[PDB]
Design a protein around this ligand. Structure first.
Ligand SMILES: [Zn+2]
Ligand SMILES: [Zn+2]
Lengths: 261, 208, 299, 36, 358
């Protein structure tokens, strides 16, 4: 009855992969796609009850991606390749939006997980986890919405695993710390698949007996809106929760004067 | 596994709650929820004087009964600004509890003060460092078992008090030690999502 | 209830004899008849059966369950002072009255005006102080004459049988004979009419508006008689569901619980708009005017 | 039931008082009032 | 003194703390206790429920309890008079209770004008020209007991007009304002979108060369074929294993030391005691802070003096006790940090006070 779902979100920002391609490094987007497909095939291999969900995170939208080889594996790989080529071939940069819709892809993944769980019969319990690979830079404006995702997963007790390739994201670190998922940056991009298999492939119960690298240290500093500097102790607004370094009689954000006689 | 015996005493319970909340800061809301099973209460003194005192103390009182409506409970809920509800079943009980989970609307007389809070990090001391000096956590210290003697954790930025759990207000200096996700956890209250337009499928001439 | 006896009683011909039925968007009255006790005893208030111990014990059980269930406001109208006193004494001897006192405070009226006034004051104070107060009076007593019950006071009104006047007064018998010899009115019919009028007076004062809801209990099998039941006010008789006809103590308790829970839920006056309450615009609707014309009935 | 964009209980000190009377053993909610 | 001694005995740790604070002259008992410093309603069932416990072995267990007697006195002041007029001279208490059981006393088996003045409800009060005793007695005494209970619960034309207004007014045809809410509308909602996250160096890419790179990668992956051998290599596999191997870079640190055996449990308990003492002292210090009244300055100075005395008289002996064993744990470092933080806070506030005055 153990139904393991491993939703994989792929950072499919064309700009970062173009930068990497111009660098002519050993690792490209094709290798990333191949590693993701192999990991998903292995996940489906480990048990019949296991399910695979692959969604590509792109700036324009979040795409639901899904001869001597397994029939279902071959069909799934064909579908994934078809969808990714259809998206990237028609991926026309129209606008200055560079940050990928990371939050939207996570929200769509959570909706898909909820729909699967509703479709899952009471006879079986569907353990769910999400693995996200980070390649491009992190986004700022999504932060709040990103937070809305995190607790939501913690609402349904879903692990969130982060695989940073190039650009670190403290948001991902905090999400992994909160939801209990694993955060780790790949030192050598060509070795990505083994990092996926050795660490992110086993389930948490399997991870329980397994010995794994300790989680990275996570900080929780704050930005003082008037200057957005690091702050240890700050003045918290009781109206709109805006934080200030110095005492103020009127809050800039809530526009409500602090009635301190 | 308690012993259900006797009758409820609204006066004593409300007096104890008020005494506990008598010294609370003005900005923090003072809300009381009461579950009333029996329709009879024994009052060692007048009850309406306590109602006046609570109203002067700006302490909100909400009542969710089980049998039927009680005039005294209705007056208490109405005068103090709270809400009085009646349980129809377990589903309605859950609905009422969920409705009481959300923060109540703020009263006009409620103050808006600029409260000062600190945000310490999870300072973990490693024995590879010569400054890995463990100290029993204040929260764990007041415990029957052995308090958590961890090398590191959360240290108060104001008085260097050590706590192994968050979010916990500091016992010594009174500082409210929180974390950034905790503040952002309630932002959906600030920005509620409006209900979507329900349209029949036949009348929805768009995507399927 | 009878629109033709008054032209006969008052010996005149009124120009218009119109009854205005009550239209309620929300049901505020729950009339129930309990002619069977816990032991399936045929509940009656005939003076031959008024001295029955089983009837007294079933009444005590009904009152105890109602006090344990229904809210503070409880009023009980008997048929005579002596019968009420004997029933109270029997309840004390049985000990059932002690449990009722444990649940709710009890107040019993006497023939003294000052004592009855103090009893009413204490009853109202207890009802407004959150402690259950039960009042015991007679259908011919002063309480049924000029005392009005608010929503929180008229929570439960229980009539112990059809209040037939003690016939030993030959003045009543002589009046019945005169009416029969001058208006073709049977004495039994007039007695039934008078008893039902007194019962309705005892019960009809428990509602003061749409938001005022109360419970009506009639603890007698004789109320099931079509002649007796048909002598009830139209606004009350219409709401008397036949499913509640001749229930038991436990069935009555369950129905009371259901009605209390249904009517204790919060309600908005806006719901009454267009259905039971009319605004300036709603009254101007010609369909509403036709409905209003259809509401009244002239006999 | 969302109300208007109004100020709410940012900091709350909630006290829950629960009856422990005889009637808590009633079966209004299964199994009894206390357990539910 | 006796009550204080009993309360201290009820909390021996506090009693030990009180001793270590007072006998060591760290704080005075006055300053010690300076910061250190149930009625039941009347139930109507106190008679029927309470019965003489007739245990089978002819045992008349009265179970005489003070609350029962107090409830009887409150409900029946006559019983209080009988008790005060008989015991301890005329009769014993138990004999009085037995007499009460045997007596018939136990075995007994208007401010508002409109709707109360039943005598005045009629405007035509002319003359009379136009087991009954047991039942009456039972009714009268029951009504008396109910009135007594109601009274113990507590322990003019204007009124008539107010009562009439309350009785006549209909909630339906009145007002339904219920708008006791304050709307809130912040100025800049973008503060939350990038909240306490500090400013990040989110660099933008170059000129149209960024579009050239995008087109290059778009064409590169437009004609893509999956690969298997290129996915991984043994050398890459060996490197990944080495990173994941014990003692590797990913395996941060490793085994640690048993702190529990490094410090005796007696030293740990004394550390707990010192932690609680210093914590309460600094809690009182911060409670006094901020100094908004001149009286608070002296109180905080006394607090600092008490902290210094406690440190010298306990931690220094505790420091020596730890040092004799040569414990490697810097448990004293935490206490020193807290003490120096408080001392620096007070010194800085004194500096601010001096600057404001000058
Ligand atoms: Zn603000
Ligand atoms: Zn602190």
């Amino acid at each position: 009855d153990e139904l393991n779902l491993l939703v994989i979100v792929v950072d499919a920002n064309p700009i970062w992969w173009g930068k990497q391609a111009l660098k002519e490094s050993q690792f490209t987007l094709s290798k990333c796609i191949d590693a993701v497909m192999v990991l998903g095939n292995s996940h489906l291999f480990m048990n019949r009850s296991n399910k695979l969900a692959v969604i590509a995170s792109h700036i324009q939208e979040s795409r639901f991606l899904y001869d001597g080889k397994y029939e279902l594996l071959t069909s799934a790989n064909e579908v994934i390749v078809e969808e990714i080529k259809d998206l990237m071939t028609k991926s026309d940069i129209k606008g200055q939006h560079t940050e990928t819709l990371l939050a939207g892809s996570l929200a769509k993944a959570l909706c898909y997980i909820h729909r699967m769980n509703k479709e899952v019969k009471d006879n079986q319990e569907m353990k769910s986890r999400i693995l996200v690979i980070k390649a491009a830079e992190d986004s700022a404006l999504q932060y709040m919405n990103f937070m809305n995702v995190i607790f939501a997963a913690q609402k349904q007790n879903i692990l969130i695993d982060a695989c940073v390739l190039d650009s670190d994201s403290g948001l991902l670190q905090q999400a992994c710390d909160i939801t209990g998922g694993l955060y780790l940056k790949v030192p050598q991009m060509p070795s990505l698949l083994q990092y996926l298999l050795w660490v992110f492939l086993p389930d948490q119960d399997q991870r329980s007996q397994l010995i794994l690298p300790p989680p990275v240290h996570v900080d929780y500093r704050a930005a003082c809106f008037c200057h957005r500097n690091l702050i240890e102790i700050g003045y918290v607004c009781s109206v709109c929760l805006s934080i200030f370094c110095n005492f103020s009689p009127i809050c800039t954000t809530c526009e409500t004067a602090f009635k301190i006689s | 596994d308690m012993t259900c015996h006797g009758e409820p005493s609204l006066y004593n319970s409300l007096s104890i709650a008020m005494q506990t909340l008598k010294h609370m800061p003005g900005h923090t809301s003072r809300e009381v929820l009461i579950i009333f099973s029996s329709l009879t209460t024994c009052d060692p003194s007048n009850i309406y004087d306590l109602i006046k005192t609570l109203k002067a103390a700006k302490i909100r009182v909400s009542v969710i009964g089980l049998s039927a409506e009680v005039r005294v409970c209705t007056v208490l809920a109405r005068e103090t600004g709270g809400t009085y509800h009646v349980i129809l079943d377990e589903s309605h009980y859950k609905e009422l509890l969920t409705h009481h989970v959300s923060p109540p609307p703020a009263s006009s007389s409620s103050e808006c003060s600029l409260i000062r809070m600190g945000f310490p990090q999870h300072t973990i001391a490693s024995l590879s460092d010569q400054d890995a000096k463990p100290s029993f956590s204040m929260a764990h210290l007041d415990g029957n078992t052995e308090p958590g003697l961890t090398l590191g954790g959360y240290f108060c930025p104001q008085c260097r008090a050590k706590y192994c759990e968050l979010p916990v207000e500091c016992k010594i200096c009174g500082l409210t030690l929180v974390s950034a996700p905790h503040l952002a956890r309630s932002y959906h209250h600030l920005f509620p999502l409006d209900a979507f337009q329900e349209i029949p499928l036949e009348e929805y001439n768009g995507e399927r | 209830s009878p629109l033709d006896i008054y032209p006969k009683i008052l010996d005149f011909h009124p120009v218009t004899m119109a009854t205005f039925t009550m239209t309620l968007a929300r049901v505020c009255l729950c009339p129930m008849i309990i002619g069977r006790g816990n032991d399936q005893v045929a509940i009656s208030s005939k003076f031959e059966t008024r001295e029955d111990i089983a009837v007294i014990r079933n009444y005590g059980n009904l009152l105890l369950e109602m006090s344990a269930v229904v809210p503070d406001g409880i009023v009980a109208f008997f048929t005579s002072y002596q019968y009420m006193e004997s029933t109270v004494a029997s309840w004390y001897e049985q000990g059932i009255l002690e449990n009722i006192q444990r649940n709710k405070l009890l107040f019993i009226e006497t023939q003294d005006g000052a004592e009855t006034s103090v009893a009413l004051e204490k009853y109202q104070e207890a009802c407004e102080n959150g402690r259950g107060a039960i009042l015991l009076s007679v259908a011919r007593g002063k309480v049924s004459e000029g005392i009005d019950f608010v929503h929180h006071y008229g929570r439960a009104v229980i009539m112990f049988g059809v209040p037939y006047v003690y016939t030993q007064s030959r003045i009543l018998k002589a009046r019945l004979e005169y009416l029969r010899d001058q208006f073709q009115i049977r004495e039994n019919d007039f007695l039934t009419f008078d008893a039902m009028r007194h019962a309705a007076q005892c019960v009809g004062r428990a509602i003061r508006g749409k938001t005022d809801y109360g419970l009506m209990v009639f603890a007698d099998k004789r109320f099931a008689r079509g002649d007796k039941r048909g002598k009830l006010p139209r606004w009350i008789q219409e709401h008397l569901t036949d499913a509640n006809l001749n229930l038991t103590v436990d069935e009555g308790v369950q129905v009371a619980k259901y009605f209390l829970r249904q009517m204790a839920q919060p309600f908005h006056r806006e719901d009454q708009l267009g259905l039971s309450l009319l605004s300036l615009e709603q009254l101007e609707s010609e369909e509403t005017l036709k409905r209003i014309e259809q509401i009244a009935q002239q006999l | 039931e969302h109300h208007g964009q109004v100020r709410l209980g940012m900091m709350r000190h909630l006290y829950v008082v629960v009856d422990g009377s005889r009637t808590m053993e009633d079966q209004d909610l299964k199994p009894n009032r206390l357990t539910c | 003194l006796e009550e204080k001694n009993r309360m201290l005995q009820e909390d021996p740790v506090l009693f030990q703390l009180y001793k270590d604070l007072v006998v060591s002259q760290v704080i005075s008992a006055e300053e010690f206790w300076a910061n250190r410093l149930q009625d039941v309603g009347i139930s109507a069932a106190f008679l029927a429920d309470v019965r003489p416990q007739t245990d089978g072995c002819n045992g008349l267990r009265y179970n005489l309890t003070s609350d029962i007697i107090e409830s009887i006195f409150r409900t029946y002041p006559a019983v209080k008079m009988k008790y005060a007029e008989n015991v301890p001279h005329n009769m014993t208490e138990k004999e009085f209770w037995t007499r009460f059981f045997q007596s018939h006393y136990f075995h007994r088996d208007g401010v508002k004008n409109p709707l109360l003045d039943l005598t005045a409800l009629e405007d035509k009060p002319l003359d009379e020209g136009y087991k009954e005793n047991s039942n009456a007695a039972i009714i009268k005494r029951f009504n008396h007991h109910s009135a007594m209970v109601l009274a113990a619960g507590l322990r003019q034309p204007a009124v008539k007009r107010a009562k009439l207004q309350e009785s006549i007014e209909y909630e339906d045809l009145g007002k339904n304002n219920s708008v006791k809410t304050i709307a809130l509308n912040l100025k800049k909602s973008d503060r939350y979108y990038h909240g306490p996250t500090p400013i990040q160096s989110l660099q933008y890419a170059t000129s149209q060369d960024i579009i050239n790179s995008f087109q290059s990668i778009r064409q590169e992956m437009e004609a893509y074929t999956p690969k298997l051998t290129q996915v991984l290599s043994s050398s890459a596999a060996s490197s990944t294993i080495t990173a994941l191997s014990p003692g590797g870079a990913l395996m941060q640190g490793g085994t640690q030391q048993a702190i529990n055996q490094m410090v005796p449990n007696d030293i740990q308990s004394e550390l707990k005691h010192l932690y609680v003492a210093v914590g309460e002292l600094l809690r009182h210090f911060w409670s006094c802070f901020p100094v908004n009244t001149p009286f608070l300055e002296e109180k905080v100075v006394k607090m600092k003096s008490n902290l210094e005395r406690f440190q010298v008289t306990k931690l220094c002996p505790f420091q020596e006790k730890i040092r004799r064993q040569y414990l490697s744990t810097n448990l004293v470092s935490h206490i020193e940090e807290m003490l120096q933080t408080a001392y620096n806070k007070l010194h800085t506030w004194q500096s601010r006070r001096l600057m404001k005055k000058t």
